[PDB]
Amino acid sequence: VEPVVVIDGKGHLVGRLASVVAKQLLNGQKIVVVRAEELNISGEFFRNKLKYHDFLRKATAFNKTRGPFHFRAPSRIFYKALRGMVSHKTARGKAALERLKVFEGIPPPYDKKKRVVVPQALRVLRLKPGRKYTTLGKLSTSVGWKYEDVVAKLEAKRKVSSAEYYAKKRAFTKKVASANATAAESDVAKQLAALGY
Amino acid sequence: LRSLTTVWAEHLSDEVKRRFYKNWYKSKKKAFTKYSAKYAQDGAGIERELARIKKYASVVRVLVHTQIRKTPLAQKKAHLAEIQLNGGSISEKVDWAREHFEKTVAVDSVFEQNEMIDAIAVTKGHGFEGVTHRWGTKKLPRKTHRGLRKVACIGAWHPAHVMWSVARAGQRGYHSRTSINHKIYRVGKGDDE
Amino acid sequence: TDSIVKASNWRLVEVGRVVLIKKGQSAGKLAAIVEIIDQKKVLIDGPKAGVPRQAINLGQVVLTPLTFALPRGARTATVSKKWAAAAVCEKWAASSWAKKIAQRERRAALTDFERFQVMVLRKQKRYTVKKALAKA
Amino acid sequence: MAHFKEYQVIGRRLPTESVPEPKLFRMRIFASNEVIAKSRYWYFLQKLHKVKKASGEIVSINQINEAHPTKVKNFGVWVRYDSRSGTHNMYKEIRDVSRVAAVETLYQDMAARHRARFRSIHILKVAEIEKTADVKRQYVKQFLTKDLKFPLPHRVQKSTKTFSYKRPSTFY
Amino acid sequence: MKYIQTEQQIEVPEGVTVSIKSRIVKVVGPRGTLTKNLKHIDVTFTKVNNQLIKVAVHNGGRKHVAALRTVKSLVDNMITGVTKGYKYKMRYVYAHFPINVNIVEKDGAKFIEVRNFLGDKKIRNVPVRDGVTIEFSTNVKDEIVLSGNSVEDVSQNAADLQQICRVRNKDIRKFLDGIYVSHKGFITEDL
RNA sequence: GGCCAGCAUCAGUUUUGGUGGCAGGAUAAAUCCAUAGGAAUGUAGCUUGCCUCGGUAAGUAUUAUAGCCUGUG
RNA sequence: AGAACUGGCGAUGCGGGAUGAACCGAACGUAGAGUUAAGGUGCCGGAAUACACGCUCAUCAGACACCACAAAAGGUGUUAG
RNA sequence: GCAGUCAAGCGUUCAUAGCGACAUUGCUUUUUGAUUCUUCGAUGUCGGCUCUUCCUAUCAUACCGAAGCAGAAUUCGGUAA
RNA sequence: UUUGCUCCACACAAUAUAGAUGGAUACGAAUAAGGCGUCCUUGUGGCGUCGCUGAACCAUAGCAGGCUAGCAACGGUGCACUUGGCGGAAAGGCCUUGGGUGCUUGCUGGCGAAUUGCAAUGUCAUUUUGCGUGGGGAUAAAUCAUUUGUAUACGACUUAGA
Ligand SMILES: [Mg+2]
Ligand SMILES: [Mg+2]
Ligand SMILES: [Mg+2]
Ligand SMILES: [Mg+2]
Ligand SMILES: [Mg+2]
Ligand SMILES: [Mg+2]
Ligand SMILES: [Mg+2]
Ligand SMILES: [Mg+2]
Ligand SMILES: [Mg+2]
Ligand SMILES: [Mg+2]
Ligand SMILES: [Mg+2]
Ligand SMILES: [Mg+2]
Ligand SMILES: [Mg+2]
Ligand SMILES: [Mg+2]
Ligand SMILES: [Mg+2]
Ligand SMILES: [Mg+2]
Ligand SMILES: [Mg+2]
Ligand SMILES: [Mg+2]
Ligand SMILES: [Mg+2]
Ligand SMILES: [Mg+2]
Ligand SMILES: [Mg+2]
Ligand SMILES: [Mg+2]
Ligand SMILES: [Mg+2]
Ligand SMILES: [Mg+2]
Ligand SMILES: [Mg+2]
Ligand SMILES: [Mg+2]
Ligand SMILES: [Mg+2]
Ligand SMILES: [Mg+2]
Ligand SMILES: [Mg+2]
Ligand SMILES: [Mg+2]
Ligand SMILES: [Mg+2]
Ligand SMILES: [Mg+2]
Ligand SMILES: [Mg+2]
Ligand SMILES: [Mg+2]
Ligand SMILES: [Mg+2]
Ligand SMILES: [Mg+2]
Ligand SMILES: [Mg+2]
Ligand SMILES: [Mg+2]
Ligand SMILES: [Mg+2]
Ligand SMILES: [Mg+2]
Ligand SMILES: [Mg+2]
Ligand SMILES: [Mg+2]
Ligand SMILES: [Mg+2]
């Protein structure tokens, strides 16, 4: 529908976000995902911490360097949920994956580009009220991720600039509405009402 | 951590310049000769790099080198390195830094008597070492065939791979080490019988 | 320094609450909650729009902000009489919701020529507005 | 077993010379179709009478429709069923708009709570509870209070495209 | 079975105004002001009038409904704590070694420093929590007093002290040494 | 007329829509209409006790200034 | 380890049970179109993140015949009786 | 070989601090048997030496809950390899 | 080593392409709550309004978009300039001034289109490189061999040499 879709991970549930992201790439839609630190997983923090430690013990006994690799960053926990939903040892699969990008925070390009959401993976739409859940960033710091603070700091900075932007814009569309209303009631506008506009 | 700029002194001793080369004698020694020209223009582009470090920068390290010529060594080529500056505000740091270009700094300005310090250095080299002395493994008995400074069992039958955790012959020494807590007993001065 | 406690003012399932039916032979049609079966199921009735008295899932319906006085479990004739009385239809019709529904129904019926007329007309409109938007 | 119709079924043991005109017995039966219905009939007659289908005959089979299908009713429901380790009688109450609707949710309920498949259940009686206050089970009493109203918090709308440009709102 | 709604009442008295957006509760009164975050629960606060507030749960289960009352309690104890306030009294208890308890400070501190416990050369320290103040009761022997607007911080600061003086490697039935909470009340008297 | 296509009219197989006429059953059951009777999650009225001028509540009260249930046609 | 009756594997590919001699479906000439079996339909992966009523929250939940295990006993967790 | 359930008894008194009969439910696969699938056109025994890694049904070491824990000493139990 | 390198420009030739074909159209936060407007005592404030999907918004007419005239506006927008400022998370982009110039389907005119034959993607994007031309610009090093021994089985390392 658009050349590149930018997804605001915040408030999405990992494997449901993954399931849709994977399909899209396979079908040829480039996807970039931001604020993976604000991803969720159902299940209380402790549960998913225990799960993560299960993962953590699997290693190649003769050489741990060849063994399963354990990435600690929310973006990359995420990639993992994703990568495992893609026939990723096939050309067709590598190709789909090159179509993907994932970030903690919203770094340049994407901070001035619109981001969407994916309602069929929106936690607030899916999880029954009262069911505990985990935030990706908090899970990740506990298994080694080093950059929650730095991301938080940048994000607060970015969030201030974006508040300005918004404000300016909302000021501007107020003017624009003031304009659109002198033109209301005019002849060309009554005609357009007639045609559903 | 990522570096965004480096600002350099305008004059550089041949001692450092030499570090930037693999064949000094043959070379035209053109290192930094355009950089040096940046000072000409009033200072314009040097200030703004300095400016840039101040505006941003979570940390400031300074670039120093040794005066290996003041040393009985034969190896002319000096050692260059980044030392993190730790007093004041970031801006005070780069002010310190700019102020000290081409200028010189002494151990007493950094260490004192009875201080506990650490030492970072590459360990002596010993080349290819067998298992006994490299790992402190027990000499096999005198009767054993095929030699005896070895490990008798290099692993069980399964895993059917030699493992990362058993001792094997190979290089010994010329390692990085970070050794800590060495008390300073004297801070001597060169100009002092 | 009064207390000031939010609110949260949900539409209620309740006898006399009008609902807009979202899928089925009816669909897009209004109806009234007559009686109330359990947390998930109500008895609805919509004579004015020709929707049969029936049991239905709340989930098949979307509650509207309109209510009118209805006796619990009132039959169809009563329903039609009270409905007309409270004139819910013009009330609905006046709502932005209703209007937004009529809008896109009209948009969807546009002829290809009409589409081309809309465009000409928006160029026309854009001209004078983009003007106004530069003199204040 | 499905979406139920309710059937009157009438049978009798076959006539004989010395006993022409045998007695004629009736059952109401909830089934998805008349084939299952006649089957169920023979199933219960044999738990009650010396008969079986080879020596009996179906006399009539008719669907009974609800008298007042758009009138909400409070049902009392009486069931026999088997569990994994014994067999048990039960009384439940179901609020709906027809016996037929009511019996569907019963099997559903029996399957969900007690894990009883259809084979394991005997409906003993389904009867409309005429006076509120002979209503016994509180999960229904609850829906009989005067001027009853309740909101439906946390509204969740079905998206029709995989991407959305807003950020939904569960208001309602 | 899911109860279609149960609700609770929260009386409000003359001194105080309570103010709740999202589920962030603010209670102001004569003794200061407390706030508490109820977002983790799902309940609907309604003002009926300046001395009454309802909290309710729609279509709730046992565990949910079970949380209605404790919400009511929590905000009740915010209101009273802001009118009467809370006072917790504890007593030192020892059979031979007199337990010595002062207030100390290191970098804007306020710590409760417990010394000599069961003879211990060790020096026990408990921080004072903010909003709780400490008096060593005159006219009563070996009594400490912790008071403040918040039952939560007062009670927890008390519990910290009684837990910093657990006995180890001893029959704690005989070795009864400790600092135990002895009375739980309000600050403003008559009430 | 070699190569490959497009459309039309057909034939074999098949898929997927729109629409017409009928048969059955409690000659569907309902709604609706008429009629008799009734009740309460009791509509008007009335009583009484509080209560900022009528709002509540707890009584009476079976169609009145809402309605519903059940049978019969 | 040993018999009975049938059906299979051995001598047999094909679709399903991830994998597998024997289970489920179905038995094979070379091909087109259609429709199904058993089994499936979040993504891997063709196919409803379909509809509907309940139940379940596990600091070692559970997840489909053959089949890749769990018992006595016990719970003021919760459900219905 | 290891661990439970019931609780008659043991334990001055007192079933369950620590134990536990008659019964009875299990788990384990460093015991020994039972089997005979793979290897008899070869997969070289027992012990020790050396060396790594793993399990936990924990002997010591950290922190705990019990006691027929006064103290010292000990015993039972939990998180723990 | 036979006139080489680099940035900008156009020119011919290639080579390609995980897949342009109107637009990736920027708050944050909450969901048992919010957006927007508006007032004010500027607050966990009053009042109004909206949702119930982007089925939107923006753009969109002209030989794939030709050649031309005029009017009404003084608006819009393309391009190359120029003024002031911002953005380091991967800023490499955003904003602002001012003159110039093109287009304007805001409205009204003149001319052109066929024969590509009843369809045939009917060719309109963006990759990397190669070769000459001429506007700026810039004028090294590494390796072998030799040598040190803080290094070394051999390579490697570390020194030294106009
Ligand atoms: Mg381990
Ligand atoms: Mg730079
Ligand atoms: Mg040696
Ligand atoms: Mg040694
Ligand atoms: Mg040594
Ligand atoms: Mg020998
Ligand atoms: Mg050895
Ligand atoms: Mg102890
Ligand atoms: Mg002791
Ligand atoms: Mg052809
Ligand atoms: Mg045909
Ligand atoms: Mg028909
Ligand atoms: Mg009424
Ligand atoms: Mg054979
Ligand atoms: Mg076969
Ligand atoms: Mg896969
Ligand atoms: Mg698929
Ligand atoms: Mg079975
Ligand atoms: Mg299997
Ligand atoms: Mg139970
Ligand atoms: Mg053994
Ligand atoms: Mg016994
Ligand atoms: Mg005892
Ligand atoms: Mg005894
Ligand atoms: Mg054998
Ligand atoms: Mg052999
Ligand atoms: Mg062999
Ligand atoms: Mg051999
Ligand atoms: Mg071998
Ligand atoms: Mg253990
Ligand atoms: Mg413990
Ligand atoms: Mg005793
Ligand atoms: Mg270990
Ligand atoms: Mg382990
Ligand atoms: Mg490609
Ligand atoms: Mg609002
Ligand atoms: Mg506002
Ligand atoms: Mg407001
Ligand atoms: Mg829009
Ligand atoms: Mg044009
Ligand atoms: Mg023209
Ligand atoms: Mg980037
Ligand atoms: Mg050139």
Rounded CA–C1' distance between C78 and I33, in angstroms: 37
Which residues of chain C are within 8 Å of residue D72 when distances are taken between CB atoms?
Answer: 35-37, 43, 55, 73
Neighbours of D81 (CB within 10 A): 18
Question: Do the beta carbons of residue E118 and residue E97 sit within 8 Å?
Answer: yes
Rounded Cα distance between E69 and E72, Å, is: 5
* DSSP H/E element including A17: helix A14-26
> Are D134 and D113 in the same domain?
yes
Kindly tell me the burial class for residue B124, based on how many C-beta atoms sit within 10 Å of its own C-beta (0-12, 13-18, 19 or more).
exposed
> Are D79 and D22 in the same domain?
no
Neighbours of A38 (CB within 10 A): 20
The last residue of one of the domains, among D48, D69, D90, is D69
Decide the pairing of beta strands E178-186 and E86-93.
antiparallel
Sheet order of strands, D73-83 included: D86-96, D73-83, D121-128
Residue of A121, D155, D147 lying closest to C61 (CA atoms): D155
CA C50 – ligand 12 centroid, Å = 22
Its sign, for the CA torsion C52, C58, C62, C64, is positive
According to DSSP, residue D133 is labeled T
Q: Name residues whose C-beta falls within 8 Å of residue A158's C-beta, 6 or more positions apart in sequence.
A: A105, A106, A111
**Angle (CA) B28 B29 B30, round 5°:** 90
Residues pairing with B63 in the sheet: B82
DSSP letters spanning B94-115? HHHHHHTTT----GGGT--TT-
Rounded Cα distance between A14 and A82, Å, is: 9
> Are D84 and D139 in the same domain?
yes
Q: Name residues whose C-beta falls within 8 Å of residue A143's C-beta, 6 or more positions apart in sequence.
A: A49, A52, A53, A56, A70, A72
CA B133 – ligand 10 centroid, Å = 84
Question: Do the beta carbons of residue A72 and residue A145 sit within 8 Å?
Answer: yes
Q: At what resolution in Å was this solved?
A: 2.8
Decide the pairing of beta strands A40-42 and E132-136.
unpaired
Rounded Cα distance between E148 and E84, Å, is: 10
DSSP letters spanning B19-73? GG-S-TTTS---TTTTTGGGGTSTTHHHHHHHHHHHHS-S--EEEEE--GGGSS-
CA distances to A143, B49, E75 from A129, in Å: 28, 54, 22
Q: Name residues whose C-beta falls within 8 Å of residue A4's C-beta, 6 or more positions apart in sequence.
A: A30, A31, A32
Structure tokens at C9: 């003012």
Give the 3-state DSSP-derived string for D30-63, with helices as H, strands as E and coil as C.
Answer: EECCHHHHHHHHHHHHCCCCCCCHHHEEEEEEEE
Q: Name residues whose C-beta falls within 8 Å of residue A91's C-beta, 6 or more positions apart in sequence.
A: none
DSSP letters spanning E29-52? ETTEEEEEE-TTT--EEEEEETTE
Question: Do the beta carbons of residue B161 and residue A62 sit within 8 Å?
Answer: yes
Question: Do the beta carbons of residue D48 and residue D11 sit within 8 Å?
Answer: no
Question: What end-to-end distance do the CA atoms of chain B give, in Å?
Answer: 46
- Say if D158 falls within a structural domain: no
Question: Do the beta carbons of residue D66 and residue D98 sit within 8 Å?
Answer: yes
Question: Do the beta carbons of residue D82 and residue D97 sit within 8 Å?
Answer: no
Rounded Cα distance between E161 and E114, Å, is: 9
> Are D52 and D99 in the same domain?
no
Each domain of chain E, given as residue ranges in start order, spans 1-85, 86-191
Grouping H, G, I as helix, E, B as strand and the rest as coil, residue A69 is coil
Phi and psi torsions of C115, nearest 5°: -55, -50
The count of domains in chain D is: 2
Please report where in the chains the tokens 């308890």 appear, as a residue.
E101
Q: Do C8 and E44 touch (CB under 8 A)?
A: yes
> Are D85 and D126 in the same domain?
yes
> Are D79 and D43 in the same domain?
no
Neighbours of D13 (CB within 10 A): 18
Interface of C with E in 4-33 (CB under 8 A): 4-8
CA distances to E104, E137, E150, E157 from E134, in Å: 11, 9, 14, 10
Residue of A48, A82, A71, A80 lying closest to A146 (CA atoms): A71
Rounded Cα distance between A39 and A37, Å, is: 5
- Say if D55 falls within a structural domain: yes
Neighbours of B130 (CB within 10 A): 16
Here the contacts of D43-50 (C-beta below 8 Å, separation 24 or greater) are: D44/D122, D45/D11, D49/D13, D49/D25, D50/D13
Distance from CA of A117 to the nearest CA of C (A): 24
Cβ B159 to strand H below 7 Å: no
* CATH at D111: 3.10.20.10
> Are D55 and D74 in the same domain?
no
Q: Do E50 and C2 touch (CB under 8 A)?
A: yes
Rounded Cα distance between C88 and C70, Å, is: 12
- Say if D93 falls within a structural domain: yes
CB-based touch E/C (3+ pairs, under 8 A): yes
Q: Which amino acid makes up residue E155?
A: S
Rounded Cα distance between C21 and C29, Å, is: 5
Distance from CA of D128 to the nearest CA of A (A): 35
CA distances to A160, B76, E9 from A106, in Å: 13, 50, 46
CA distances to A183, A186, C106, C124, C125 from C118, in Å: 16, 15, 12, 10, 10
Rounded Cα distance between A119 and A17, Å, is: 9
Residue of A5, C134, C95 lying closest to D164 (CA atoms): A5
| Closest C1' nucleotide to C78's CA | F67
Rounded Cα distance between A42 and A16, Å, is: 11
Decide the pairing of beta strands E86-93 and E100-104.
unpaired
Question: Do the beta carbons of residue D91 and residue D77 sit within 8 Å?
Answer: yes
- Residues of E at the C interface, defined by Cβ within 8 angstroms: 2, 4, 12, 17-22, 28, 44-47, 50, 53, 59
Question: Do the beta carbons of residue E69 and residue E55 sit within 8 Å?
Answer: no
Residues pairing with E113 in the sheet: E102, E125
Structural domain of residue D37, as residue ranges?
A: 3-69
Q: What is the CATH number of domain E86-191?
A: 3.90.930.12
Rounded CA–C1' distance between E167 and H12, in angstroms: 32
Which of E1, E3, E58 is nearest residue D151 as measured by Cβ atoms?
A: E58
Phi and psi torsions of D74, nearest 5°: -100, 110
Residue of B67, B42, B54 lying closest to B96 (CA atoms): B54
Rounded Cα distance between D70 and C35, Å, is: 10
> Are D106 and D131 in the same domain?
yes
- Say if D122 falls within a structural domain: yes
Question: Do the beta carbons of residue E64 and residue E7 sit within 8 Å?
Answer: no
Sheet order of strands, E32-37 included: E17-21, E24-29, E32-37
Measured between CB atoms, does E64 come within 8 Å of chain A? yes
Structure tokens at B192: 């002092």
Helix%, strand%, coil% for chain C, nearest 5: 45, 30, 30
Residue of D95, D91, D93 lying closest to D148 (CA atoms): D95
- Say if D86 falls within a structural domain: yes
Number of H helices, E strands in chain C: 4, 6
> Are D8 and D33 in the same domain?
yes
Kindly tell me the burial class for residue A122, based on how many C-beta atoms sit within 10 Å of its own C-beta (0-12, 13-18, 19 or more).
buried
Q: Do E58 and D153 touch (CB under 8 A)?
A: yes
> Are D11 and D59 in the same domain?
yes
According to DSSP, residue A11 is labeled T
Question: Do the beta carbons of residue B175 and residue B123 sit within 8 Å?
Answer: yes
Q: Name residues whose C-beta falls within 8 Å of residue D89's C-beta, 6 or more positions apart in sequence.
A: D78, D79, D80, D124
- Say if D151 falls within a structural domain: no
Q: Name residues whose C-beta falls within 8 Å of residue C100's C-beta, 6 or more positions apart in sequence.
A: none
Measured between CB atoms, does E22 come within 8 Å of chain D? no
DSSP letters spanning E38-105? -TTT--EEEEEETTEEEEEEEEE-HHHHHHHHHHHHHHHHHHHHHHT-EEEEEEEE-SSSPPEEEEE-
> Are D57 and D83 in the same domain?
no
CB-based touch C/B (3+ pairs, under 8 A): no
| CB-defined contacts D:E, below 8 A | 15
Rounded Cα distance between D99 and D76, Å, is: 10
Positions in chain I where some atom is under 7 Å from a protein CB: 18-20, 24-34, 36-38, 44-46, 49-61, 73-76, 87-94, 105-107, 138-143, 148, 150-153, 158-162
- Say if D119 falls within a structural domain: yes
Rounded Cα distance between D101 and D81, Å, is: 20
Residue of A141, A130, A168 lying closest to A77 (CA atoms): A141
Sheet order of strands, C30-38 included: C51-57, C41-46, C30-38, C17-21, C61-67
Q: Do B159 and A64 touch (CB under 8 A)?
A: no
Residue of C65, C61, C8, C69 lying closest to C37 (CA atoms): C61
Q: What is the CATH number of domain E1-85?
A: 3.90.930.12
Rounded Cα distance between E48 and E39, Å, is: 21
Rounded CA–C1' distance between B48 and I84, in angstroms: 19
Rounded Cα distance between A149 and A153, Å, is: 6
Residue of E81, E5, E156, B155 lying closest to A63 (CA atoms): B155
Neighbours of A42 (CB within 10 A): 18
Which residues of chain A are within 8 Å of residue C125 when distances are taken between CB atoms?
Answer: 183, 186, 188-189, 192
